[PDB]
Design a protein around this ligand. Structure first.
Ligand SMILES: CC(C)c1cc2c(-c3ccc(S(=O)(=O)NC4CCS(=O)(=O)CC4)cc3)ccnc2[nH]1
Length: 352
């Protein structure tokens, strides 16, 4: 037989014999991930087990979307597919999906605990911006970027792990909402620069080493935002639904703090003239990302062209050919369990 089984915690991993020495590196509501050695490729890989992905609509849609996008996206700043398999030998018996991926060294939560020089900080931000733009070019807006779903290597290279939001679910896993934009928090429309809000929260956290807006729920989340940045102007208020508008206008009013006070020189390398100029430019970029009103917030391309970032600019990275997404209905599906099962199985086996 071409497979063997190993127990990983309370889970059983049944994998191809080419993959050896499995070790757990991560977990989530969607599945469980092990590092492993690929004896054929002669390199380390990551293996994600998806257990019965067709069990409900939220898991099924996410799994199907993940499979399709990994098969059609190929960019250095998005985690790359190496293999997919199932150990079950028929549609009738089909249960689990295994996705094999590039293995990276660490997540951004680990990097946030470190003091970063301007070269490394700006290069990480550049790469995030290239990954995001590439997704936007294919009509994919992430909306859920956070430190835990961004990974790095010791050479400062960076990859985004996931493709973002689509959703009730029975799960012990708690949802992190600290990086979500005001327009997502308040149920407004959104465009591409929704993702720039999240990059600003991440950047701010890299500088300060603390979560900017650590809200317990969406109501607390909003409070934390206005405390730091100030109550938005009347022009923004007028874009909200009446029921939301009454709520937002009724909160206590806050003046907010200047970006000089939010992010002072002591948080940046600021010894040499070189570092002093860079600190000033870093603060300017923050001031253009952490903007409540999306109509006044910076675009992804404006961010790529910013003085802090543009030293890295390369069109083969920042202007790559868009992904060819085959499924025109990739974000608007409703199916039965047996239908999702067959759709996913066909994708894993590569059938139509
Ligand atoms: C942490 C670091 C060592 C690392 C994680 C990782 C993954 C990885 C990919 C997906 C998952 S997951 O399917 O469990 N998704 C999680 C990510 C963390 S989260 O808080 O966003 C919940 C979903 C876990 C690890 C893939 C490749 N290299 C890696 N290096």
């Amino acid at each position: 037989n071409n497979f063997y089984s190993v127990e990983i915690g309370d889970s059983t991993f049944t994998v191809l014999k080419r993959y050896q020495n499995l070790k757990p590196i991560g977990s989530g509501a969607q599945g469980i991930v092990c590092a492993a050695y690929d004896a054929i490729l002669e390199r380390n890989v990551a293996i994600k087990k998806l257990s019965r992905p067709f069990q409900n609509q939220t898991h099924a849609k996410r799994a199907y979307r993940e499979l399709v996008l990994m098969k059609c996206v190929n960019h250095k700043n998005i985690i790359g597919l190496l293999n997919v398999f199932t150990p079950q030998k028929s549609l009738e018996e089909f249960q689990d999906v295994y996705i094999v991926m590039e293995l990276m060294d660490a997540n951004l939560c680990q990097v946030i605990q470190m003091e970063l020089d301007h070269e490394r900080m700006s290069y990480l931000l550049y790469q995030m911006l290239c990954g995001i733009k590439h997704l936007h070019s294919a009509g994919i807006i992430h909306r859920d970027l956070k430190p835990s779903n961004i990974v790095v290597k010791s050479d400062c290279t960076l990859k985004i792990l996931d493709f973002g939001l689509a959703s009730f679910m029975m799960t012990p896993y708690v949802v992190t909402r600290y990086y979500r934009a005001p327009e997502v928090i308040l149920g407004m429309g959104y465009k591409e620069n929704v993702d720039l809000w999240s990059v600003g929260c991440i950047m701010g956290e890299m500088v300060c080493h603390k979560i900017l807006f650590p809200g317990r729920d969406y109501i607390d989340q909003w409070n934390k935002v206005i405390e730091q940045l100030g109550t938005p102007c009347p022009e923004f208020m007028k874009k909200l639904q009446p029921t939301v508008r009454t709520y937002v206008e009724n909160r206590p009013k806050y003046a907010g703090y200047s970006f000089e006070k939010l992010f002072p020189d002591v948080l940046f390398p600021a010894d040499s003239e070189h570092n002093k100029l860079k600190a000033s430019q870093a603060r300017d970029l923050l001031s253009k990302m952490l903007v409540i009103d999306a109509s006044k917030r910076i675009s992804v391309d404006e961010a790529l062209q910013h003085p802090y970032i543009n030293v890295w600019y390369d069109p083969s990275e920042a202007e790559a050919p868009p992904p060819k997404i085959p499924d025109k209905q990739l974000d608007e599906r409703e199916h039965t369990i047996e239908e999702w099962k067959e759709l996913i199985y066909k994708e894993v086996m590569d059938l139509e």
